[PDB]
Amino acid sequence: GVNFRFSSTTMTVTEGEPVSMECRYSRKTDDRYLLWGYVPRGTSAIKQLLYWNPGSDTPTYISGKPGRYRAEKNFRQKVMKLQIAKATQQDSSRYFCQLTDNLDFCSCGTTLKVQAVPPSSAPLVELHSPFAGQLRENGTATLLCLASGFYPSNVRISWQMDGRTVTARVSQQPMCQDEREKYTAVSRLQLSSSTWMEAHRYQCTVTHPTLSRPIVKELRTLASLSLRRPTIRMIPPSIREMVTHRNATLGCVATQFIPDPITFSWMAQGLEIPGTSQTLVPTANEDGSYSARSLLTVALADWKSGISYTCQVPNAQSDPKNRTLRVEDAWLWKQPSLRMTVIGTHVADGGTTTLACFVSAFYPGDIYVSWREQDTELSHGVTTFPVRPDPDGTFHTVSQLSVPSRAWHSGHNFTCLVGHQSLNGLKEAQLRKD
Amino acid sequence: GGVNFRFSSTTMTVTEGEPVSMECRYSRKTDDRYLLWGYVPRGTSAIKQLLYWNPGSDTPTYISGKPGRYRAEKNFRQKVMKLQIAKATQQDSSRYFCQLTDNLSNGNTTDFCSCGTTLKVQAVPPSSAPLVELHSPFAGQLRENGTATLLCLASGFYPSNVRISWQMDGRTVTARVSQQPMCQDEREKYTAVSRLQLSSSTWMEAHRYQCTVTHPTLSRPIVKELRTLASLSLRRPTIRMIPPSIREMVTHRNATLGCVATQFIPDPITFSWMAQGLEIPGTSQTLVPTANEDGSYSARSLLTVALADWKSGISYTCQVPNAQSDPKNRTLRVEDAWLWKQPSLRMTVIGGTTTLACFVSAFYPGDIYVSWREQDTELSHGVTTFPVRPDPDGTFHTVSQLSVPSRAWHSGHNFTCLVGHQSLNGLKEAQLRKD
Ligand SMILES: *[C@@H]1O[C@H](CO[C@@H]2O[C@@H](C)[C@@H](O)[C@@H](O)[C@@H]2O)[C@@H](O[C@@H]2O[C@H](CO)[C@@H](O[C@@H]3O[C@H](CO)[C@@H](O)[C@H](O)[C@@H]3O)[C@H](O)[C@H]2NC(C)=O)[C@H](O)[C@H]1NC(C)=O
Ligand SMILES: *[C@@H]1O[C@H](CO)[C@@H](O[C@@H]2O[C@H](CO)[C@@H](O)[C@H](O)[C@H]2NC(C)=O)[C@H](O)[C@H]1NC(C)=O
Ligand SMILES: *[C@@H]1O[C@H](CO)[C@@H](O)[C@H](O)[C@H]1NC(C)=O
Ligand SMILES: *[C@@H]1O[C@H](CO)[C@@H](O)[C@H](O)[C@H]1NC(C)=O
Ligand SMILES: *[C@@H]1O[C@H](CO)[C@@H](O)[C@H](O)[C@H]1NC(C)=O
Ligand SMILES: *[C@@H]1O[C@H](CO)[C@@H](O)[C@H](O)[C@H]1NC(C)=O
Ligand SMILES: *[C@@H]1O[C@H](CO)[C@@H](O)[C@H](O)[C@H]1NC(C)=O
């Protein structure tokens, strides 16, 4: 007569769920009473719950309420089962499979622990993405939908784009659980460069029984400025350089939205000019875009001949319209007319006489006006007004020079020089006193 | 009798290499029978004996003389019998029985009562490396005002000895860092989530956040970084003042001052006008700004006053909520009257088309109004007034030309050049005829 308990074992069940205890025996003769018993809470004696008579597979319940227990003996498979239908906390006891020959008791037992049902909680949903702004760079993306801290594990995470349910490229890692029996699910939606850089409305919808309405997170992305074609602007040569240095410098300003170094190439009449292709580092701007500038110097004769100079940067517009600098048709040029006058008439004094040079009837409007006292260039007192357009289609301007009366009444020569595109040199107009 | 029970609804699980501690409790009150530990070898159905205790003795008598991997212990006081396996192997996965009998050997000792269980031996999970992901709300310059929550996720790693830490601008941050309890999937891989809550102020500032994840499967810590610039939505509106145009002052005889407020928030901007510091009633007005090519929004408010009030020297100030406190670049006042210079006019002929020139010089400030009249009729065609240019003398000067057909110049008409300036109470005239 011995009641063993394997105290290094236990059976755990959630409150309300059924328990299925089972014992295997090695007897080859069905000649003994088989019993299922349990030790009630607060005592130390094994109260009998049910038994089978030797040779009979019919359970003989003696205690409890016939409905809470379900027994089953099968001498073929050598099994004796006892099931508790709806586990309660009071069921947490020691349970024994017993064998005896008359009501010499040999029993083998274990313990039963009854855990509570975890409190149902609602999932916290978080939708995350890489930088989803306008300045978003080119590349593939991975949208993330995290749902944490919920019970039970019957959560559904779905993806939508522009109202349409998306199924491809949706990967959800295996379900997860912490020490507090709260679950965590992670869904990911992988997006190609094309779709990611377009304006779209992504949505993650999470459905859970603790929620009457699904939790919907939204990400509304505008079209990416990284797919905008680089803008090229041309800077024509300055007349100042054309008359002074007699070089001609053309400029090419390329504005991208990618900070990558920009490589510029120059073509003359379609053919690339050797030794002129050059790469420069762009410069960040106000809107976030980057801008670089390339310069190309040519001879004055080549520029005035009518050569078409084209600027090309990789991935630009095919129309060479806003990318080409060429001198205008020669029959459209108008030579500037110069008209000088003097205003601001013992004299002596610190009086100032002002000389005016009217430059009119020229095309295009780029003009260079300078003043010279004999054979010396003047910088002080010179005021060249901006060029204004004519109803005749040409342009006109005025240039003033304030000189002390000491130099005008002495008898110096005052020259107004005008350099223009339609001139092979500089057109002079002299003005002396007497 | 004689029965070998096994509670088949129970089992014991151990990781390979770790020790196993089996234990049985008995209800016998006399230490008068042999207690033994046995196990069923893999591939049979008979209980092979492993060790036994003589009745009354707590000293183990192992069946093989040497307890190598096994270590037994009986204590009849507490009625306990324990058996420990040092490093569980896969062959240790068997059925184990604590047995009681009154006589050993002799085949069928008809007093064999045994209680048994099973033992499962699991392998150590393969160590994997954590995938680290740092996430945040929109972290651009135009990021909206509000509190933020940065997230550092580390998934798919083993074992669970991972460390997630946060840094701001190189300084380790500890406050407001919350990590939910560690988590585990069916493949015994762990997942940890750390969160850093940030107040509106700190989030809207330029900062360098960092999440550092350390794990034994990593030779070098994984560091994720998020560099946010200062937000332009907390930028104070910039106010620019527009003084009245002399054109309006001479024609309409009012004086309209302008206030251009530039924010980065599209909210309607409320303007208030003060005269000599005191607010002018009826002038507070809120209007909706207009976005420009920069992301900012800009609005303009106008205030009309009498010419006498403006020219007297009253200081007019423009105020917008949450703007600069210094009223210097927010105030419009006419300059001291002794700094004004009246414009000097000099007419000439330079030119069929004859062109007349009117040189207006030595005036301050530079706002000037030039008009032409043929006797008593204002001219609009052929008039060209050049922009005002500064003098080394400190004043300003400009030219206005008029191209007229030779018929009117050679006929003998009066050609008047009118000039209105701030230093003039009317219009200064200069006539030029042929004769
Ligand atoms: C130049 O500015 C003066 C100053 O007037 C002030 O600014 C104006 C833009 C308006 O907002 C005015 O309300 C404000 O006071 C203007 O003088 C104003 O002229 C009008 C029209 O003549 C006057 O209204 C009339 O006034 C008389 C007498 O007060 C009443 O009988 C009429 O029923 C009617 O209200 C107004 O009073 C007067 N403001 C004064 C004197 O302070 C002036 O019109 C303006 N110039 C132009 C060309 O607009
Ligand atoms: C950005 O939001 C913060 C947080 O709301 C604002 O700071 C304070 O916010 C409280 C509560 O909403 C308000 O009552 C206070 O007026 C705010 N005070 C200060 C001193 O900031 C903050 O003002 C907001 N910033 C902008 C530019 O709107
Ligand atoms: C966009 O980025 C992907 C890599 O993510 C690359 O394959 C693709 O070529 C990029 N697009 C362009 C136009 O360079
Ligand atoms: C023009 O440009 C060339 C090439 O840079 C330079 O060597 C030369 O001095 C310049 N000469 C004139 C006349 O412009
Ligand atoms: C040049 O710019 C104008 C105006 O922006 C545009 O109409 C024209 O198509 C452009 N030419 C090109 C891109 O070749
Ligand atoms: C006013 O504006 C000027 C513009 O350059 C600036 O330099 C100056 O500091 C401003 N003064 C203020 C805000 O008091
Ligand atoms: C021009 O006006 C003046 C007065 O300013 C007058 O004496 C003269 O006769 C006028 N000439 C003509 C042609 O009307």
Side-chain angles (χ1 to χ4, degrees):
Chain A
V2 52
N3 300 333
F4 276 116
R5 190 177 62 86
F6 229 115
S7 53
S8 60
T9 69
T10 176
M11 293 194 304
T12 302
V13 288
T14 310
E15 197 171 21
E17 297 306 314
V19 199
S20 298
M21 330 192 174
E22 180 182 313
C23 275
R24 307 288 296 266
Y25 35 92
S26 64
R27 277 202 148 263
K28 299 182 176 182
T29 55
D30 200 355
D31 55 359
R32 260 74 170 176
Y33 296 81
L34 288 173
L35 317 137
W36 270 107
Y38 88 112
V39 178
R41 296 179 57 91
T43 174
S44 48
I46 299 180
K47 175 170 180 174
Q48 313 291 263
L49 265 178
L50 60 96
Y51 71 97
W52 289 279
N53 286 324
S56 162
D57 289 12
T58 296
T60 315
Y61 303 92
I62 62 175
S63 53
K65 294 194 181 302
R68 184 151 162 254
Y69 303 103
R70 292 186 193 95
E72 173 188 344
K73 179 226 274 180
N74 182 257
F75 199 81
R76 170 157 284 274
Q77 295 173 323
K78 305 291 177 305
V79 295
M80 50 182 306
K81 306 183 184 181
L82 165 62
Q83 180 182 24
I84 312 184
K86 298 177 184 173
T88 187
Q89 278 293 341
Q90 289 176 337
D91 281 323
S92 186
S93 301
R94 285 161 292 179
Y95 289 74
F96 293 86
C97 316
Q98 314 176 288
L99 177 147
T100 184
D101 55 7
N102 192 288
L103 298 178
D104 205 333
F105 48 97
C106 168
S107 51
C108 177
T110 194
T111 54
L112 176 68
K113 301 176 164 174
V114 182
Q115 309 299 339
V117 182
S120 299
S121 54
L124 171 59
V125 180
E126 309 184 5
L127 186 61
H128 294 281
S129 76
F131 184 78
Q134 271 200 315
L135 298 187
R136 160 179 70 258
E137 60 282 347
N138 140 269
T140 57
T142 307
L143 292 193
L144 179 54
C145 203
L146 171 71
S148 51
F150 59 95
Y151 187 87
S153 66
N154 40 8
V155 72
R156 293 283 191 272
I157 304 178
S158 67
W159 293 90
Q160 295 84 39
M161 188 186 301
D162 306 307
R164 302 176 179 90
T165 303
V166 177
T167 305
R169 304 217 211 182
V170 176
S171 179
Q172 192 181 305
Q173 68 179 41
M175 185 65 71
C176 192
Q177 194 158 202
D178 58 15
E179 311 295 305
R180 330 268 127 260
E181 286 161 343
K182 298 310 180 220
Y183 291 84
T184 298
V186 181
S187 179
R188 287 177 238 266
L189 174 60
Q190 201 259 313
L191 301 181
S192 62
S193 311
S194 299
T195 56
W196 175 235
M197 302 201 291
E198 293 167 9
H200 281 324
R201 211 178 57 85
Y202 315 99
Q203 270 184 178
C204 175
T205 292
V206 175
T207 77
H208 194 257
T210 64
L211 303 172
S212 51
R213 297 174 178 274
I215 292 181
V216 181
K217 297 294 170 181
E218 185 197 66
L219 173 62
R220 203 171 183 184
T221 70
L222 284 178
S224 178
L225 299 191
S226 55
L227 56 76
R228 279 184 158 174
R229 293 187 87 89
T231 299
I232 292 185
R233 199 176 182 255
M234 301 299 285
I235 304 182
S238 67
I239 192 68
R240 182 64 181 260
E241 179 204 3
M242 281 183 41
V243 300
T244 59
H245 307 98
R246 308 134 217 202
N247 272 177
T249 297
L250 298 69
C252 185
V253 182
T255 299
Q256 298 185 320
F257 277 92
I258 300 299
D260 290 5
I262 305 174
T263 60
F264 298 79
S265 287
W266 290 94
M267 289 89 179
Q269 299 276 96
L271 284 191
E272 195 214 3
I273 311 174
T276 59
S277 183
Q278 56 180 358
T279 175
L280 280 307
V281 186
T283 297
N285 288 114
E286 287 174 351
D287 43 33
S289 63
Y290 309 85
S291 299
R293 192 177 68 189
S294 176
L295 297 179
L296 170 70
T297 301
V298 303
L300 191 63
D302 298 333
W303 168 251
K304 290 193 177 185
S305 70
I307 295 177
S308 294
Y309 297 99
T310 313
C311 175
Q312 188 54 225
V313 311
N315 306 117
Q317 60 258 34
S318 68
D319 192 10
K321 184 68 181 300
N322 307 346
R323 291 189 293 97
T324 46
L325 279 174
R326 190 188 190 180
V327 73
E328 294 184 72
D329 291 337
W331 49 88
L332 303 180
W333 302 353
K334 294 293 191 303
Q335 304 186 276
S337 63
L338 312 191
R339 297 177 141 163
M340 293 200 58
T341 184
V342 49
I343 195 64
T345 307
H346 192 20
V347 182
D349 299 350
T352 298
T353 52
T354 309
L355 302 170
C357 193
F358 294 69
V359 188
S360 55
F362 55 97
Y363 186 88
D366 204 6
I367 200 74
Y368 169 65
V369 189
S370 178
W371 290 85
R372 279 166 83 110
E373 185 173 6
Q374 303 279 112
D375 290 333
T376 296
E377 191 173 339
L378 289 169
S379 55
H380 300 295
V382 186
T383 296
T384 296
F385 289 90
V387 192
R388 247 54 177 175
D390 274 323
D392 307 337
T394 57
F395 296 93
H396 68 281
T397 187
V398 185
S399 182
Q400 294 185 191
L401 166 73
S402 294
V403 60
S405 295
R406 189 174 303 271
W408 175 253
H409 295 264
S410 66
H412 278 276
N413 211 231
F414 290 104
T415 322
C416 167
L417 293 71
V418 165
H420 187 246
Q421 188 181 239
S422 70
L423 279 46
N424 294 321
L426 280 65
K427 188 173 181 176
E428 314 197 3
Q430 289 181 0
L431 192 58
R432 199 188 319 109
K433 186 182 177 180
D434 57 330
Chain B
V3 52
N4 299 332
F5 276 116
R6 192 251 293 189
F7 228 106
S8 53
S9 60
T10 69
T11 176
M12 293 195 304
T13 58
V14 288
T15 311
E16 197 171 21
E18 298 306 314
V20 198
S21 298
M22 329 192 174
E23 180 182 313
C24 278
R25 308 288 296 266
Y26 35 93
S27 64
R28 281 299 288 204
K29 300 182 176 182
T30 54
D31 199 355
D32 55 359
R33 263 166 205 187
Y34 297 81
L35 288 173
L36 43 160
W37 272 108
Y39 88 111
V40 178
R42 297 180 128 267
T44 174
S45 48
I47 299 180
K48 176 169 180 173
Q49 314 291 14
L50 190 60
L51 60 97
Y52 76 99
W53 287 278
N54 285 324
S57 162
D58 55 9
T59 63
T61 315
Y62 303 91
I63 204 184
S64 178
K66 292 194 179 301
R69 56 186 303 100
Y70 305 104
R71 291 183 191 93
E73 172 189 344
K74 180 224 274 180
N75 182 257
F76 200 81
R77 169 156 284 274
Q78 296 173 82
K79 305 290 177 305
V80 295
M81 49 182 306
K82 304 185 184 182
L83 166 62
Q84 181 182 24
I85 312 184
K87 293 182 182 175
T89 187
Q90 279 293 340
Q91 286 178 337
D92 281 324
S93 186
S94 301
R95 284 161 291 179
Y96 289 74
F97 294 87
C98 50
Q99 216 152 6
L100 177 147
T101 183
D102 55 8
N103 192 288
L104 299 178
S105 304
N106 296 279
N108 54 331
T109 160
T110 176
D111 204 333
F112 243 164
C113 171
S114 51
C115 179
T117 194
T118 55
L119 175 68
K120 301 176 164 174
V121 182
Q122 309 299 339
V124 181
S127 299
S128 54
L131 171 59
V132 180
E133 308 183 4
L134 187 152
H135 295 281
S136 76
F138 183 78
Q141 270 200 315
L142 296 188
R143 66 178 173 277
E144 63 284 347
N145 194 13
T147 57
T149 307
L150 286 53
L151 179 138
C152 203
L153 171 71
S155 52
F157 59 95
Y158 188 87
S160 66
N161 40 8
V162 72
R163 294 283 193 272
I164 304 178
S165 67
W166 292 90
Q167 295 84 39
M168 255 187 61
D169 306 306
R171 303 176 180 90
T172 303
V173 177
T174 170
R176 305 273 264 274
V177 176
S178 179
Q179 191 182 305
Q180 68 179 41
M182 184 64 71
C183 193
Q184 195 156 203
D185 57 15
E186 312 298 305
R187 331 222 167 87
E188 286 161 344
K189 298 310 179 59
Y190 293 85
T191 298
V193 182
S194 180
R195 287 176 175 86
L196 174 60
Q197 200 259 313
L198 300 182
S199 62
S200 311
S201 299
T202 56
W203 173 236
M204 305 294 289
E205 294 166 9
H207 281 324
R208 211 177 57 86
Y209 314 99
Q210 270 184 177
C211 174
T212 292
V213 175
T214 77
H215 194 257
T217 63
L218 303 172
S219 51
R220 299 173 179 273
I222 291 182
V223 181
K224 295 293 170 181
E225 185 196 322
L226 173 63
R227 200 173 182 185
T228 70
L229 284 178
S231 178
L232 299 191
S233 54
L234 57 75
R235 184 101 71 93
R236 296 185 89 90
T238 299
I239 291 185
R240 141 176 180 255
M241 302 299 284
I242 304 182
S245 67
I246 192 68
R247 181 65 182 261
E248 179 203 3
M249 281 185 286
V250 300
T251 60
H252 307 98
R253 312 289 315 281
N254 276 181
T256 297
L257 298 69
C259 184
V260 182
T262 67
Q263 297 185 148
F264 278 91
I265 299 298
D267 290 5
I269 305 174
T270 304
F271 298 79
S272 287
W273 290 93
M274 289 88 179
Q276 299 275 96
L278 283 305
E279 195 215 2
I280 311 174
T283 60
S284 183
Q285 56 179 148
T286 175
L287 59 119
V288 186
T290 297
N292 338 269
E293 285 177 351
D294 42 35
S296 7
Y297 309 85
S298 299
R300 193 177 70 188
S301 176
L302 297 180
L303 170 70
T304 301
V305 303
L307 283 188
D309 298 333
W310 168 250
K311 290 193 176 186
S312 71
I314 295 177
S315 293
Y316 295 99
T317 313
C318 175
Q319 190 54 71
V320 156
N322 307 117
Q324 60 259 34
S325 68
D326 192 10
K328 185 66 182 300
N329 297 348
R330 291 190 294 98
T331 287
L332 279 174
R333 183 191 184 182
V334 73
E335 294 184 72
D336 291 337
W338 48 89
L339 302 180
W340 303 353
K341 295 293 191 303
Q342 303 187 0
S344 176
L345 312 191
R346 296 177 141 162
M347 293 201 58
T348 184
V349 49
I350 194 64
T353 298
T354 52
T355 309
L356 302 171
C358 193
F359 293 70
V360 188
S361 55
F363 55 96
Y364 188 89
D367 204 6
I368 201 74
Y369 169 64
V370 188
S371 178
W372 289 85
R373 278 166 81 110
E374 185 173 6
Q375 302 186 329
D376 290 333
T377 38
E378 189 174 339
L379 289 169
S380 55
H381 301 295
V383 186
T384 296
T385 296
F386 288 91
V388 192
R389 247 54 177 175
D391 273 323
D393 307 337
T395 57
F396 295 90
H397 68 281
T398 187
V399 184
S400 182
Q401 69 179 65
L402 165 74
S403 294
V404 60
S406 295
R407 190 174 304 271
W409 174 250
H410 295 263
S411 66
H413 278 276
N414 266 334
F415 290 105
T416 321
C417 168
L418 295 184
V419 165
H421 186 246
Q422 187 182 76
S423 69
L424 283 181
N425 294 321
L427 281 168
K428 190 172 182 175
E429 316 197 3
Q431 288 182 0
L432 191 59
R433 199 186 319 108
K434 186 183 176 181
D435 58 329

